[PDB]
Amino acid sequence: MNIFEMLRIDEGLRLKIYKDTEGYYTIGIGHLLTKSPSLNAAKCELDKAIGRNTNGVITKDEAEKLFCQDVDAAVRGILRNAKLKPVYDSLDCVRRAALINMVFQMGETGVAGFCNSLRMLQQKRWDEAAVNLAKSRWYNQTPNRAKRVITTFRTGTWDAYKNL
Ligand code: NA
Ligand code: NA
Ligand code: NA
């Protein structure tokens, strides 16, 4: 298991524009196009992201290319963030993937504000951090995904992604 396979499990793969769990136009492996309610706006975002007139449909290779970019943008945003970088730097490779997953889903700004959960992760108080992370809108709105990510932080293993 690795960050690509992990996010592929959590985000799925769809080749036509769809609405994500928040109702926002998305394509591929969780590539958010726009928060605008306009499908036309989403289509402009898509054609711009792919570099051609897509008519709302892409190939698997194109989806994987956006995913390459999006995973790196999650990492780059962690490293540029004064609250997230020290946590990321303190973590092992598996738990780093859990943090990347959170940032991919919710954005740098939101995760960076979880000052108690971040402190507990930095302190390597894994069970405490896991309890604290579950006191979140994130956990309540996407509990199965959050449980997998939280188990990854709690254990430092990929056990929650086995058989998926
Ligand atoms: Na545009
Ligand atoms: Na940043
Ligand atoms: Na603990």
Residue numbers in the entry: 1 to 164
Task: Give excerpts from the publication.
After immersing the cross-linked crystals into a precipitant-free solution containing 50 mM phosphate buffer at pH7, 0.2 M NaCl, and 30% (v/v) glycerol, the X-ray diffraction data were collected under a cold nitrogen gas stream at 100 K. The diffraction patterns were indexed in the space group P3221 with cell constants of a = b = 60.0 Å and c = 97.1 Å, where one of the six independent molecules is contained within the asymmetric unit. The unit cell volume was slightly smaller than those of non-treated crystals of TA (a = b = 61.5 Å and c = 95.9 Å) and another TA-T26H mutant (a = b = 61.5 Å and c = 97.7 Å). The structure refinement at 1.10 Å resolution converged to crystallographic R work/R free values of 14.8/16.8%. In the unit cell, one independent molecule forms a trimer unit with two neighboring molecules through intermolecular disulfide bonds, Cys44−Cys115’ and Cys115−Cys44’, respectively. The chemical oxidation time of a week was enough to complete the disulfide formation over all molecules in the crystal. These disulfide bond lengths are estimated as both 2.05 Å based on the electron densities of cysteine sulfur atoms. One trimer is further connected to another trimer through two disulfide bonds, Cys68−Cys93’ and Cys93−Cys68’, with each bond length of 2.03 Å. These bond lengths correspond to the typical disulfide bond length. Although there are no large conformational differences between the structures, the small displacements of main-chain atoms are seen at the residues behind Cys44 and before Cys115, which could be caused by the formation of intermolecular disulfide bonds, Cys44−Cys115’ and Cys115−Cys44’.
Here, using T4 phage lysozyme as a model protein, the three-dimensional rigidification of protein crystals was conducted by introducing disulfide cross-links between neighboring molecules in the crystal. Many mutation studies have been carried out based on the cysteine-free pseudo-wild type T4L (TA), carrying the C54T and C97A mutations, to characterize the functions of selected residues. In this study, four residues (Ser44, Asn68, Ala93, and Thr115) located at the crystal packing contacts of TA were mutated to cysteine (designated as SNAT-T4L) so that all neighboring molecules in the crystal can be bridged by intermolecular disulfide cross-links. The disulfide cross-linking was subsequently achieved by soaking copper sulfate as an oxidizing agent directly into the crystal.
